[PDB]
Design a protein around this ligand. Structure first.
Ligand SMILES: O=C(NCCOc1ccccc1)c1nc([C@@H]2CCCN2C(=O)COc2ccccc2Cl)[nH]c(=O)c1O
Ligand SMILES: [Mn+2]
Ligand SMILES: [Mn+2]
Length: 179
């Protein structure tokens, strides 16, 4: 029974918490044990949902937060509909306006290295990459940040609020040294 686990259950939305729990168990990890990852997954999830809300009505197809089988099903349909190359790894969104998959990153480490690693892991470069940080930086492929300023600024504001609430509970240091 950890502090971090009760903090995330009171800081995040119950639908987020439940999607994160299902995600971890699906991949064989327990939110009561990997409590920092529990917090990271909830955070990444809230950011993906905030991101897809930044566009227009039908702009984004949401891939993250689904179970692996149906997440790939929607990808297959998108690819067999748009002609876009099927990614090797599951992305987080699809942009019907720009016709590309988006990989959304939330890092506690430093802006530049995270993109590299995630770029070298993707290693296909078809899908667009967008990174956010807990300190307020962002970085996107070809410096095309997809959404307008205010929607990304809202995402950055919420990330710093998560940081503050954790720091005020002396949980930030453990979370930062977890990646
Ligand atoms: O969809 C993804 N993974 C498929 C599911 O993998 C799982 C693995 C274990 C438990 C549950 C699910 C995906 N994964 C990653 C990172 C890097 C690759 C491994 N990884 C993770 O283990 C995910 O933990 C994170 C670390 C930092 C920030 C956010 C996250 Cl969520 N980052 C993303 O932005 C992302 O969308
Ligand atoms: Mn994902
Ligand atoms: Mn992601």
């Amino acid at each position: 029974g950890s502090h971090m686990e009760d903090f995330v259950r009171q800081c995040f939305n119950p639908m987020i918490v439940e999607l994160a729990e299902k995600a971890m168990k699906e991949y064989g990890e327990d939110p009561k044990i990997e409590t920092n990852k529990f917090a990271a997954i909830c955070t990444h999830l809230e950011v993906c949902f905030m991101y897809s809300d930044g566009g227009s009505k039908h702009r984004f197809e949401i891939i993250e937060g689904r179970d692996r089988i149906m997440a790939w099903t929607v990808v297959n349909s998108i690819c067999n509909t748009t002609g876009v190359e099927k990614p090797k790894f599951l992305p987080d969104l699809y942009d019907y306006k720009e016709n590309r998959f988006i990989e959304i990153g939330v890092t506690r480490r430093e802006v530049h290295i995270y993109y590299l690693e995630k770029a070298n892991k993707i290693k296909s470069e078809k899908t667009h990459i967008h990174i956010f940080s807990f300190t307020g930086e962002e970085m996107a492929t070809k410096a095309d940040y997809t959404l307008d300023e205010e929607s990304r600024a809202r995402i950055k504001t919420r990330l710093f609020t998560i940081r503050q609430e954790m720091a005020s509970r002396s949980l930030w240091d453990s979370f930062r040294q977890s990646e």
